[PDB]
From a paper:
EGFP is an archetypical autofluorescent protein in terms of structure and function. It comprises a core β-barrel capped at each end. Running through the centre of the barrel is a kinked helix that houses the distinctive p-hydroxybenzylidene-imidazolinone (HBI) chromophore. HBI forms as a result of covalent rearrangement of three residues resident in the central helix (Thr65-Tyr67-Gly68).
Thus, the structure of EGFPD190Δ allows us to investigate the structural impact of a deletion in a loop. The crystal structure of EGFPD190Δ encompassed residues Lys3–Thr230. The backbone trace between the two structures starts to diverge after the deleted residue and does not converge back to the general structure until Leu195. Therefore, in the present context the main backbone changes are exerted immediately after the deletion and are not propagated either side, with the placement of the flanking β-strands unchanged. However, deletion of Asp190 alters the conformation of this loop, repositioning it so that the backbone N and O atoms of Val193 are within hydrogen-bonding distance of the carboxamide side chain of Asn159 in the adjacent tight turn linking β-strands S7 and S8. Overall, there is a net gain of one hydrogen bond between the residues in EGFPD190Δ compared with EGFP. Thus, the deletion of a residue within a loop does not just cause general loop shortening: a whole host of local and long-range interactions are lost and formed so as to accommodate such a change.
Author numbering: 3 to 64, 68 to 189, 191 to 230
The structure:
Amino acid sequence: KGEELFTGVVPILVELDGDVNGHKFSVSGEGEGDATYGKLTLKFICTTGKLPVPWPTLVTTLVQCFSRYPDHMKQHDFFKSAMPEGYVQERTIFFKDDGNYKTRAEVKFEGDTLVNRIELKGIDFKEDGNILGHKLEYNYNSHNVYIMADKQKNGIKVNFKIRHNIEDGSVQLADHYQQNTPIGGPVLLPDNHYLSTQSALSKDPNEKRDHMVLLEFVTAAGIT
């Protein structure tokens, strides 16, 4: 099954094409994932120069097939079951009192490498709000990512809210609506559960380009 593709360390490639309020940018990432630990190591570069939005706002867009599904949870791992053909991941992300992102990604193997290829469109932002004004702290918090079967088609529906810490001490919420559908034949759909997701963001002091180093940790768990 798809799960067998994830028993060891897997190389990852990420490519994101973005446009936020007409500000166009691209991001390239590379690294590796180890799903038997639930761990990601990635480095992202803004290949168009300086990123026009805060790096933390792109974390969720920039591979949930690397989550650790413990044995008792394994039948309910949609993300790996869809591999190697992969899945389409679509989101709408609403920044409270500000604009929204819409994203479409394909997450799939290309040879030995797990690829996440994304298009992102952002609209309705304030040019000196928290996003386009760069007012978000360079950090990330712990979230629970809630997963249900889609009733209408073979896929999952996923819901969570991200808490982005603002530099003046407040929190910028980002409500995420997500759906995933297989690129290949249908899969068995999971019972309701969640992913416990932790992300930590850092810098390489020797890297001169605008970039983000990102280590994540993710484990599935049952409800409640």
